[PDB]
Design a binder for this molecule. Structure first.
Ligand SMILES: [Zn+2]
Lengths: 282, 694, 349, 48
RNA sequence: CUGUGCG
């Protein structure tokens, strides 16, 4: 029953983090057994918050921690502060267009495209084109650079409706004088070239995201009273039990799923006698 | 196979098939036909029905000498009262007369018998193990002289490695002058080192690797610097170009990989050599060839010196096994009663302490037992430690087992932790016993320990044979077995002197004594002398048959026996089956009575035993014999020399370099016997090439 | 003693070498693979990368026994070498480039990389993986120890290691650079880092790959209980008593004949044709499906192929030969407790 | 998708005799299908 | 064919 396994993975990830902080990379996700998300060939339903990131794990990204906030749509509602540069003959047209794309959430990115056209010089009228190629570069996540490659073809630049302001301007910059569908990436990769990277690792400690030591948000999960107790059993050692039961009630303060009824189930919980832990939080 | 290189390897089988078809179609004797038809097949157990089984007028005499008393149909109750009568007779003719074969233990008298047989009272040896055995004397002296008391050396060892690697290429086709060249390099680098840094010959060399005018060379050979200058004096004037010829030869047709930038071409200045020689006075070794005990009373020794004694023993064993590994094809520069002076002997080094180092000097190389001399060097002063004579092959175990034996000691002693005070007098005794066993490897010691195991088996139990004590005594030689035997019997007595019956903590005592007896496995089992070993093997092989009197002289080797041979053949067969069931004289001679065989066979046939003949799954579904153990056989040597000589004749289609010997190394694959055989076959092939040359 | 004996020959002590020091009563229910794994684990004081590789091997075993659908592609991936195969295992299990350039930092020198140590010893006069030799031996049907060791030392100082070319050992051990970057110092002369072997890199293989291979071997050998972490516990020298092995096998323990032959024919026909079964007339019984595709023999056959120091298949088709072990309560008191919770982590059903 | 050189490896593995004769005399690129061109498909092993 | 070390 996909929902039950979903909440079971949720509780497994919550309680595994309950002992020590960890990063949400493939090292700490794919190393857990539960992992029925690549199962369920009809994968219409998912858990909740992580529904974003695992949507890429079905294609196995080599990422550490992307800033997934598609709830604030980054593909749409994008600033169009775009421009262009001159050319450098090798007819050969070489251009380098740099943009400062942002997102709906708190984010920023700079994306530059290097484009080369091999064309034929015209006699008088316009031009004669043969072949065109482009290459992307610069910062941008799996959604940010997709945004960039989508907007680079949706711009009043050369491609579109003319908008070729020649005016003997770019020739004057090139010749010194003062007289008168490349969408095959769809990934996190910076398109074979980009700036420095590998910083800002997110760590997860108490069900709350910590980008560098700051709390971002915490989600919800139930514990019934049977899954929690049966998951309390051994692991390998005892101070893990100490930490997890010391931190469970603080997480319970953010949840209202008080469904652990009082019966001998409480005693089978109590088997691991830790009274002052469960009375400390209060 | 009948294959060859002249046919298309598909016609010979057809020819054979047609030939056999023709021969089976018609003929024209008896065996010739079958042999010829059997020799043309390809592949073909029991059921040899085609055999003739012909007689030669001798099978009968075998038959009535073997199959006259055999019936195998005797009924059962007759066997019953025959056995009843036999037992009744046996009871009152041989058992009441005291002619039995087994008896009760009577433990005490067994203890006095053991003490009499083991503990020697008529011997003149002293009760002091260290000074009865030479090796233990030497190791005691070393350990009690040791307990109570910088890039020059590494550069020296590196150049030793360089020269010792380059010597193995034998690129000069000569040996004596090659060693002369190496020692010339050695003295040149001596005088190069000693030109400056005056605190190197007296400080980093005396405490490093040198003794009185005795400097190590290549091939673990130590040579006297005096004779070094004396030999360098020659080859000058007679052929002053010699060193020059040694200089251009290391560049062309040479590996040309050397660090001898200047230490080689320099002329040796003899004044520096003689100054170095006169710097050090002569303390030349003696190597004593061919009475008061003050030996520290090992029984009153601390619990520290014994492990260091074992460690020194291990170091000496490693030095001995390193001396094993010295080169065989080595000849000294100058050849050599009761005191022989050493000037060009071989030496090995072993390490004890930060300043003092031990040296083991020996004169011959090879594989077998030799004589060695142990010396020490504390701070450049060379002292006398001793000399001995032994076979290094029997010292492989203690090479590094200086810790496992100790652990064995404390664990075996702690086996007896039930009584406080029994460990104190048994621990050191056991350790001394182990030390003596390791330092004196011989067959006699392990045979004596086996006799102890049998003695323990008889004592701890109740009934034993009457001929037990006679199989426990072994004659003693060299006065080294007496001490180990005394230690063993003393341990046995001390553990079993008093009330030691099977009504107390006796199982662990039995275990401890059994392990003491099994300590015999420490000695390696590899026949100290082999020739005497075939002597004894043949001796005990042929003694019983000569005693019986049926060992005939060389037969025809083809199936014909002379009249005397067959006569004594039948005589031996009759004597084998000429034993009665009443006479007690024949109780140790080989033979058996046909009557009791009839009894047993008849009783077994009629399903009376626990098993019967109701079997299932019916059963009917190039070395030379004259020399065993030799590495090579005469047939093999002849085959190899013939192959080599044929190959060399074929290649001569003159001139032949030493590469012919390479062929010897190609078809052969070395120990001393291996290299002697290789030298012999090299000799043979060389004079073979010589005779074909004429 | 044996470690000193082999070191004296100039070979140099290695992470496997001889039998490990500081062992425990757990010679029972443990083969050569288990003690070698124990030695490797004891090499590292604080087990973090070994624990990570054990989790990787646990995941691989979980998905190779019944999980997902897998196997017979590891046959492809392992045959290349040590580095690429281990990496590929990592992203099949889940890793990062940081793992790739972090785990592969621990390297050890393997002199028998381009083959075997050439040598001639004091043998009797006149006279390819070892697994093939073991199969050949199984299908078919005066020298002194002192002189044997003497010949060993003799042959061990000559041009023995092979490259490309024959050369000595000492230049191999002197080509290493003593960088001492706090990662090649916790176990001297055993493990080195990547930049410490830039001068000579042909004889350089990772050790975590070997540890992973042995972990998978133990998974095929004696169960999945070797995946947990060792925990330590919290007698008159005379209390002897008997122990039975407590091994659980998930490889169809019976393991009759003619099962390895079909697997090696299927996966490596070239190795099956030459160097294998010329002398056989009953090929047909193993030819027409003599129980092909065993529970785990298909995957645990290539690890004995690639690594020449396992000796597992030749170990597999033999009796324990002991079936009982005498021990004292004194040694049982301090024996390490290594029992694993379920790899499902037992919440599954 | 069911690319080429997948049935050939299966028929070689299961029936080497049928693979040897009556099959692939006229082929020079055996190696691509020989060194694990995706052996042991999802169901082609049984439905062959 | 072709050994240099137990500090
Ligand atoms: Zn004395």
């Amino acid at each position: 029953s996909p929902q039950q396994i979903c909440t079971n993975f949720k509780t497994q990830l919550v309680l595994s983090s309950m002992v020590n902080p960890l990063v949400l990379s493939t090292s700490c996700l794919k190393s857990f057994f539960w992992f029925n998300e690549v199962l369920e060939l009809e994968d219409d339903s998912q858990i909740e918050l992580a529904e974003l990131t695992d949507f890429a794990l079905m294609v196995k990204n080599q990422n550490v921690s992307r800033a997934m906030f598609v709830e604030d749509i980054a593909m749409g509602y994008v600033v169009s502060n775009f421009e262009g540069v001159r050319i450098s003959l090798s007819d050969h047209v070489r251009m380098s267009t740099k943009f400062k794309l942002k997102r709906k959430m708190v984010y920023s990115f700079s994306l530059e495209c290097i484009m080369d056209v091999g064309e034929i010089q015209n006699k008088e009228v316009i031009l004669k084109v043969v072949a065109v190629d482009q290459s992307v570069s610069g910062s941008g996540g799996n959604h940010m650079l997709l945004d960039g490659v989508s907007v680079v073809a949706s711009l009043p630049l050369f491609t579109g409706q003319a908008s070729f302001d020649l005016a003997a301007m770019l020739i004057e910059s090139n010749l010194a004088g003062s007289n008168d569908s490349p969408e095959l990436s769809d990934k996190y990769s910076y398109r074979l070239s980009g700036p420095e990277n590998q910083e800002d690792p997110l760590v997860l400690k108490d069900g709350a995201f910590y980008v560098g030591g700051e709390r971002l948000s915490t989600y919800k999960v139930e514990f019934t009273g049977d899954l929690v107790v049966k998951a309390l059993g051994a692991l390998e050692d005892d101070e893990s039990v100490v930490s997890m039961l010391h931190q469970l009630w603080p997480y319970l303060k953010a949840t209202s799923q008080v469904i652990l009824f009082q019966q001998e189930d409480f005693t089978i919980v109590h088997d691991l006698y830790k009274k002052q832990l469960t009375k400390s939080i209060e | 196979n009948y294959n060859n290189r002249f046919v298309a390897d598909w016609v010979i089988e057809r020819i054979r098939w047609l030939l056999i078809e023709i021969l089976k179609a018609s003929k024209s004797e008896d065996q010739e036909y079958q042999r010829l038809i059997h020799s043309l097949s390809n592949v073909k157990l029991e059921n040899l029905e085609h055999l003739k089984r012909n007689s030669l007028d001798y099978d009968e005499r075998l038959n009535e000498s073997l199959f006259i008393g055999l019936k195998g149909d005797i009924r059962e109750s007759t066997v019953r009262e025959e056995l009843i009568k036999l037992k009744l007779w046996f009871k009152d003719e041989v058992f009441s007369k005291g002619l039995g074969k087994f008896k009760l233990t009577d433990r005490r008298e067994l203890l006095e018998s053991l003490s009499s047989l083991g503990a020697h009272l008529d011997s003149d040896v002293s009760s002091c193990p260290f000074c009865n055995n030479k090796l233990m004397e030497i190791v005691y002296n070393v350990t009690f002289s040791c307990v109570e008391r910088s890039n020059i050396e590494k550069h020296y060892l590196s150049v030793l490695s360089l020269c010792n690697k380059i010597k193995g290429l034998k690129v000069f086709n000569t040996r004596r002058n090659t060693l002369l060249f190496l020692d010339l390099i050695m003295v040149n680098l001596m005088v190069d080192i000693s030109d400056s840094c005056q605190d190197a010959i007296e400080s980093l060399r005396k405490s490093g690797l040198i003794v009185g005018q005795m400097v190590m060379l290549v091939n673990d050979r130590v040579l006297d610097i005096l004779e070094a200058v004396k030999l360098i004096r020659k080859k000058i004037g007679t052929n002053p170009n010699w060193v020059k010829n040694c200089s251009k030869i290391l560049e062309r047709s040479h590996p040309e990989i050397w660090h001898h930038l200047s230490t080689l071409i320099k002329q040796p200045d003899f004044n520096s050599l003689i100054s170095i020689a006169q710097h050090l006075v002569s303390d030349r070794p003696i190597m004593r060839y061919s009475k008061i005990c003050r030996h520290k009373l090992f029984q009153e020794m601390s619990s520290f010196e014994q492990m260091r004694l074992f460690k020194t023993l291990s170091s000496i064993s490693l030095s001995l096994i390193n001396s094993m590994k010295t080169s065989f094809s080595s000849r000294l520069l100058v050849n050599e009663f009761g005191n022989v002076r050493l000037r060009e002997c071989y030496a090995q080094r072993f390490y004890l302490a930060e300043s003092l180092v031990g040296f083991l000097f020996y004169q011959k190389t090879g594989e077998r037992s030799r004589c060695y001399s142990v010396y020490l060097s504390d701070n450049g002063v060379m002292s006398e430690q001793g000399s001995f004579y032994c076979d290094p092959k029997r010292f492989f175990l203690p090479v590094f087992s200086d810790e496992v034996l100790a652990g064995m000691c404390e664990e075996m002693t702690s086996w007896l932790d039930f009584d406080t005070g029994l460990m104190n007098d048994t621990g050191p005794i056991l350790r001394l016993l182990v030390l003596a066993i390791l330092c004196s490897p011989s067959k006699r010691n392990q045979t004596f320990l086996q006799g102890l195991r049998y003695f323990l088996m008889a004592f701890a139990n109740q009934i034993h044979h009457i001929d037990l004590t006679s199989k426990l005594v072994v004659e003693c030689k060299s006065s080294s077995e007496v001490v180990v035997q005394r230690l063993a019997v003393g341990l046995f007595i001390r553990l079993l002197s008093g009330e030691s019956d099977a009504s107390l903590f006796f199982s662990r005592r039995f275990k401890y004594l059994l392990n003491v007896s099994y300590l015999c496995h420490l000695i390696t089992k590899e026949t100290p002398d082999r020739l005497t070993d075939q002597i004894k093997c043949f001796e005990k092989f042929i003694e019983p048959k000569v005693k019986f009197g049926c060992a005939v002289v060389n037969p025809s080797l083809n199936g014909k026996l002379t009249v005397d041979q067959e006569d004594i053949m039948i005589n031996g067969l009759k004597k084998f089956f000429s034993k009665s069931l009443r006479d007690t004289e024949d109780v140790q001679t080989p033979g058996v009575c046909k009557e009791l065989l009839n009894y047993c066979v008849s009783l077994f046939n009629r399903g009376k035993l626990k098993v019967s003949g109701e079997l299932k799954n019916n059963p009917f579904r190039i070395p030379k014999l004259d020399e065993l153990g030799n590495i090579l056989s005469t047939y093999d040597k002849e085959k190899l020399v013939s192959a080599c000589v044929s190959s060399m004749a074929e290649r001569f289609k003159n001139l032949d370099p030493d590469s012919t010997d390479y062929l010897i190394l190609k078809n052969l694959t070395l120990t001393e016997e291996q290299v002697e055989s290789f030298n012999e076959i090299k000799h043979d092939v060389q004079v073979a090439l010589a005779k074909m040359a004429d | 003693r044996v470690n000193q004996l082999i070191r004296y020959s100039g070979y140099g002590e290695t992470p496997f070498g001889a039998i490990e020091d500081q062992d425990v009563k757990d010679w029972v229910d443990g083969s050569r693979g288990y003690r070698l794994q124990r030695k490797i684990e004891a090499i590292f004081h604080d087990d973090k990368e070994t624990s990570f590789i054990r989790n990787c091997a646990r995941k691989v075993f979980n998905d190779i026994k019944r999980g997902r659908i897998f196997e017979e592609n590891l046959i492809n991936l392992i045959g290349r070498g040590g580095d690429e195969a281990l990496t590929g295992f990592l992203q099949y299990a889940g890793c990062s480039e940081q793992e790739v350039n972090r785990v592969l930092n621990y390297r050890w020198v393997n002199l028998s990389s381009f083959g075997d140590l050439r040598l001639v010893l004091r043998t009797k006069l006149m006279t390819v993986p070892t697994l093939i030799k073991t199969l050949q031996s199984k299908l078919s049907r005066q020298s002194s120890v002192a002189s044997g060791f003497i010949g060993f030392c003799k042959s061990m100082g000559s041009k023995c290691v092979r490259d490309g070319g024959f050369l000595y050992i000492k230049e191999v051990y002197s080509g290493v650079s003593a960088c001492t970057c706090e990662i090649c110092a916790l176990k001297p002369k055993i493990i080195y880092c990547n930049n410490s072997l830039n001068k000579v890199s042909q004889f350089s293989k990772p050790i975590l790959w070997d540890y992973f291979s042995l972990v998978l071997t133990n998974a095929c050998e004696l169960g999945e209980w070797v995946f947990s972490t060792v925990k330590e516990p919290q007698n008159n020298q005379n209390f002897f008593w008997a122990v039975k092995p407590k091994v659980v096998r998930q490889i169809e323990d019976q393991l009759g004949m003619n099962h390895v032959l079909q697997s090696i024919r299927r996966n490596y026909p070239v190795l099956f044709d030459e160097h294998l079964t010329p002398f056989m007339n009953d090929l047909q019984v193993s030819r027409t499906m003599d129980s092909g595709r065993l529970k785990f023999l298909d995957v645990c056959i290539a690890l004995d192929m690639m690594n020449e120091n396992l000796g597992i298949i030749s170990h597999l088709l033999k009796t324990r030969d002991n079936s009982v072990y005498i021990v004292k309560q004194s040694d049982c008191a301090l024996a390490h407790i290594r029992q694993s919770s379920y790899t499902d982590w037992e919440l599954g059903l």
